[PDB]
Design a protein around this ligand. Structure first.
Ligand SMILES: Nc1nc2c(ncn2[C@@H]2O[C@H](COP(=O)(O)OP(=O)(O)OP(=O)(O)O)[C@@H](O)[C@H]2O)c(=O)[nH]1
Ligand SMILES: Nc1nc2c(ncn2[C@@H]2O[C@H](COP(=O)(O)OP(=O)(O)OP(=O)(O)O)[C@@H](O)[C@H]2O)c(=O)[nH]1
Lengths: 49, 438, 49, 427
């Protein structure tokens, strides 16, 4: 989680204004319940050395 | 000059300090490497960072904070983070053993052999410092390692240094939410130890912070990053006077003298007015009037205190951004004319105003608004005693059945100190209505 | 025309130093403006005693 | 020749003196770099009243800036005229005030009074012969009240034969911002009445009402307020620097203004205040100046003397006027409201006419007043002092500093004696 929010600067392929009047809750919603999962998670330099 | 030292005790108290420095590095444009672009700001260490960072001839901004923790998990994790090159390694004070949520264990078992080490850090930070108005302690009442270890060190820094201020910031225990039933044990233990030494204790509660998110920010599923952003914004707002100037410049010493009315009770309440979503900022307008209504609106307080159940003593409003005295002095005058806000008759005036020209800025990847005018509301009211009133009837039962005492008496402690806090507490409520009674 | 119309429209032409960045009028006019004098720049040289 | 040295005290006076001195530079026509653009002989002649000479035609201001907080001093130095102020004239300290009256009166001043006295006496030896001194500060200001009271006391025994002019701004009566402000004011005013001989009382709220009235510009800057007070203080000083058959000495003014020694507090009054279209809609004529000069709305100082009566009135006119119009105008107002003066003194007007118009307008004037309008002021602070002294709020600090309710008893007792005094002479 720290890597995502702080280091990875969160999810790139996401659309920025993915939050607006929705369906059931006819308001700003479809922003984030999915959360990033992609990209090398465990690839700092100390492992290879 | 005008500098201070920030303290971060407890592994829950370090990510909040992490975010603040992350927030702090933005407004000064600090690159994660530790150096500016080719623009000339490096030297002997004298610019807007000199109050926050230590960018010496070496060229690397050194934050004037020390992160202390008892468990190496998170601290090593952030030691592998993004700005770890900025962070001085051994002021990220790591630990090899935990206090097991025990105040005394962190206060007695392990705090002794570690305080001397951090004592070397503070003095070697003291020698390089010049004016060092005071301290910035980040901690928690229900601290597994925040409670006990901070208590010893604040005793030690109080006795050796009693000529400077100490600013306290801890998450207040959730009145109805408890992740630990030992939290009432250490929390009142911390309070009774700190009442005669702490200068300015500032608290906050996460539930209403959570309640804010889906009220006006309309976030039903925020995260700590948002939570840490809000509190980091709060400390950023109060520290802008050190960073920049304004129509008038205020300081913690003015805050201390004017906020705390009488000894013991030094527990005011903060608030941030333009807590609003980005979209709401777009198609609306912000001005001093409505935010002054919002700042004094009871549901905007992060502490579950109802002002009409108490009475007001002090109100410190720190206007950061583009404001004029005209509407500000008129708006507060209207507030003085309002009937519902029941200030005590003791204080005709209870308003400490601070004006700062610098507009509050947004953070990349953030969730706040594009604030032109902001204000921080440091206020103290008598509606807070119910919180301690809540704690004691929680505490009086459990102590009467003396649960978990075998853990504390097992590690060498006893009940006499536990007895002290209850009449120490009972002293706190009894004074509260005494000052509450006109 | 809103409240306080006439002068606000008229002052911008006499006040020929408008800032370009948004909201910087207070930053620009932090020192102040020219209110306590005539629009003309110079009335010295009057050897009138 | 007879000169004046200025003292820039308190953090408000830091803005005041900054605005006060730049107007004078603009009035006399010196560039910000300091090379005087020789334009008027009379100001060329009479700049030595306030400015000394450095090499290169640079009029050095004979003013002293004092503070504790570097940042404010850096700002004014980075101002348009910081270069004309001397680094020598920048004396300060390494500590924070806490907006504390006692710390600046016993703790921090102790190691700074030595330095400031040396600087001023060095400046005193630099100049030849002084009328006296004037001070820009505030009575409700934390450090300003602490410093000046110490300084005015020390300079009293230093030179008890000069003019101890005091220019202090009264904080807002409705809200004082600082809660301990009444303590600071009551402490300060106790020493003030003992040490001072003249006092200007200035209130921010009235200036806000003034902006609502004639400025009509909604949002001003506090420096623009500093512009207003500087213009008034410029006018009262135009008498000394400019020729014309008017007697300018403050002693000449003070004896005509002070019937009894304990009368130190005085209220200002200024001349044409003009709105957006009325510049070209104004026939600037002595009747309408006199009418606007004696307007309760035109007043700016404390609160309406309508509540009381008028002891001494003194107005200075700056422009191309004649003795006859000022004479009849006083006769006009004398007939307009005769009973509103006190029977104790008739014909209590003191007129001086400066023949040199200001740079920007011709017909102008300044008024200094001593009327029964101050009773409400210290009566107001009386209830505040008693209410907070009723249960000793915010008191552990000063006892921690080493002060006691000892000092507060006679401080208000001295203040109370003033209440009956202003009552007794009039009522
Ligand atoms: N200050 C702070 N508190 C948090 C955070 N997240 C959760 N909390 C709450 O704060 C409490 C932290 O107290 P402790 O668990 O005693 O922290 P500690 O003393 O450093 O020692 P540990 O028990 O190892 O965490 C938790 O019980 C949470 O309820 C956070 O990010 N910062
Ligand atoms: N410089 C300045 N002062 C102001 C302004 N508005 C109000 N003031 C008041 O003017 C007072 C006088 O300043 P000082 O005498 O220098 O005060 P101090 O001793 O430095 O301590 P403080 O009163 O806390 O500032 C202050 O107390 C302010 O409350 C303003 O816009 N600029």
């Amino acid at each position: 989680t720290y890597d995502d929010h702080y280091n990875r600067h969160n999810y790139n392929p996401g659309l920025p204004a993915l939050r607006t009047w929705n369906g059931q809750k006819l308001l700003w919603l479809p922003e984030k319940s999915d959360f990033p999962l992609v990209a090398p998670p465990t690839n700092y330099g100390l492992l290879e050395q | 000059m005008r500098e201070c030292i920030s303290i971060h005790v407890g592994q829950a108290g370090v990510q909040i300090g992490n975010a603040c420095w992350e927030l702090y590095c933005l407004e000064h444009g600090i690159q994660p490497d530790g150096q500016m672009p080719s623009d000339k700001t490096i030297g002997g260490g004298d610019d807007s960072f000199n109050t926050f960072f230590s960018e010496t001839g070496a060229g690397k901004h050194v934050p004037r904070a020390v992160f202390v923790d008892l468990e190496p998990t998170v601290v090593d994790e952030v030691r592998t983070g993004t700005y770890r090159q900025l962070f001085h390694p051994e002021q990220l004070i790591t630990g090899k053993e935990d206090a097991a949520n025990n105040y005394a264990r962190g206060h007695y078992t392990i705090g002794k052999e570690i305080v001397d080490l951090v004592l070397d850090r503070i003095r070697k930070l003291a020698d390089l410092c010049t004016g060092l108005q005071g301290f910035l302690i980040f901690h928690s009442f229900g601290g597994g390692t925040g409670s006990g270890f901070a208590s010893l060190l604040m005793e030690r820094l109080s006795v050796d240094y009693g000529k400077k201020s100490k600013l306290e910031f801890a998450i207040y225990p959730a009145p109805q939410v408890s992740t630990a039933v030992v939290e009432p044990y250490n929390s009142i233990l911390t309070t009774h130890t700190t009442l005669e030494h702490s200068d300015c204790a500032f608290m906050v509660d996460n539930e209403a912070i959570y309640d804010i998110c889906r009220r006006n920010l309309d976030i039903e599923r925020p995260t700590y990053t948002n939570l840490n952003r809000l509190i980091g914004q709060i400390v950023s707002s109060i520290t802008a006077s050190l960073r920049f100037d304004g129509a008038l410049n205020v300081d913690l010493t003015e805050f201390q003298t004017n906020l705390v009315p009488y000894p013991r009770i030094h527990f005011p309440l903060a608030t941030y007015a333009p807590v609003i979503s980005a979209e709401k900022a777009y198609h609306e307008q912000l001005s001093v009037a409505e935010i002054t209504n919002a700042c004094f609106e009871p549901a905007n307080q992060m502490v579950k205190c109802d002002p009409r159940h108490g009475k007001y003593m002090a109100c410190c409003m720190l206007y950061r951004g583009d404001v004029v005295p005209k509407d500000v002095n008129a708006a507060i005058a209207t507030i003085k004319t309002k009937r519902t806000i029941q200030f005590v008759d003791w204080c005709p005036t209870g308003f400490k105003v601070g004006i700062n020209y610098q507009p509050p800025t947004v953070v990349p990847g953030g969730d706040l608004a594009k604030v032109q005018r902001a204000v921080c509301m440091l206020s103290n009211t008598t509606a807070i005693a119910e919180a301690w009133a809540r704690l004691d009837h929680k505490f009086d039962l459990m102590y009467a059945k003396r649960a978990f005492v075998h853990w504390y008496v097992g590690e060498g402690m006893e009940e006499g100190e536990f007895s002290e806090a209850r009449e120490d507490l009972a002293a706190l409520e009894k004074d509260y209505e005494e000052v509450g009674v006109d | 025309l809103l409240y306080n119309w006439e002068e606000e429209r008229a002052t911008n032409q006499l006040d020929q130093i408008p800032p370009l960045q948004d909201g910087s009028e207070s930053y620009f006019f932090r020192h102040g403006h020219q209110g306590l004098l005539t629009t003309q720049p110079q009335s010295p040289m009057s050897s009138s005693t | 020749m007879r000169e004046i040295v200025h003292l820039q005290a308190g953090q408000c006076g830091n803005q005041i003196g900054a605005k006060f001195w730049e107007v004078i530079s603009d009035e006399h026509g010196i560039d910000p770099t300091g090379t005087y653009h020789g334009d008027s002989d009379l100001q060329l002649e009479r700049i030595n009243v306030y400015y000394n000479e450095a090499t290169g035609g640079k009029y050095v201001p004979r003013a002293v800036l004092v503070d504790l907080e570097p940042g404010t001093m850096d700002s004014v130095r980075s101002g348009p005229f910081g270069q004309i102020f001397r680094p020598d004239n920048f004396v300060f300290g390494q500590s924070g005030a806490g907006n504390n009256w006692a710390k600046g009166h016993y703790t921090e001043g102790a190691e700074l009074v030595d330095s400031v006295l040396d600087v001023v006496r060095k400046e005193a030896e630099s100049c030849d012969c002084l009328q006296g001194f004037q001070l820009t500060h505030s009575l409700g200001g934390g450090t300003g009240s602490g410093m000046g009271t110490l300084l005015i006391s020390k300079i009293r025994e230093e030179y008890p034969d000069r003019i101890m002019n005091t220019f202090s701004v009264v904080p807002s009566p409705k809200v004082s911002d600082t809660v301990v402000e009444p303590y600071n004011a009551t402490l300060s005013v106790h020493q003030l009445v003992e040490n001072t001989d003249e006092t200007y009382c200035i209130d921010n709220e009235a200036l806000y009402d003034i902006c609502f009235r004639t400025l009509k510009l909604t949002t001003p800057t506090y420096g623009d307020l500093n512009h207003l007070v500087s213009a008034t203080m410029s006018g009262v000083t135009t008498c000394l620097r400019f020729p014309g058959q008017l007697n300018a000495d403050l002693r000449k003014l003070a004896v005509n203004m002070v019937p009894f020694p304990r009368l130190h507090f005085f209220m200002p009054g200024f001349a044409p205040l003009t709105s957006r279209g009325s510049q070209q809609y104004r026939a600037l004529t002595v009747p309408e100046l006199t009418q606007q000069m004696f307007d309760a709305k035109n007043m700016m100082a404390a609160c309406d003397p309508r509540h009381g009566r008028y002891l001494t009135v003194a107005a200075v006119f700056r422009g191309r006027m004649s003795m006859k119009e000022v004479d009849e105008q006083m006769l006009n107002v004398q007939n307009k409201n005769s009973s509103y003066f006190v029977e104790w003194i008739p014909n209590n007007v003191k007129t001086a006419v400066c023949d040199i118009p200001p740079r920007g307008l011709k017909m102008s004037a300044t008024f200094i007043g001593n009327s029964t309008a101050i009773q409400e002021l210290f009566k107001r602070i009386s209830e505040q002092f008693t209410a907070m002294f009723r249960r000793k709020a915010f008191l552990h600090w000063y006892t921690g500093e080493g002060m006691d309710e000892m000092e507060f008893t006679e401080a208000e007792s001295n203040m109370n004696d003033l209440v009956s005094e202003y009552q007794q002479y009039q009522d």
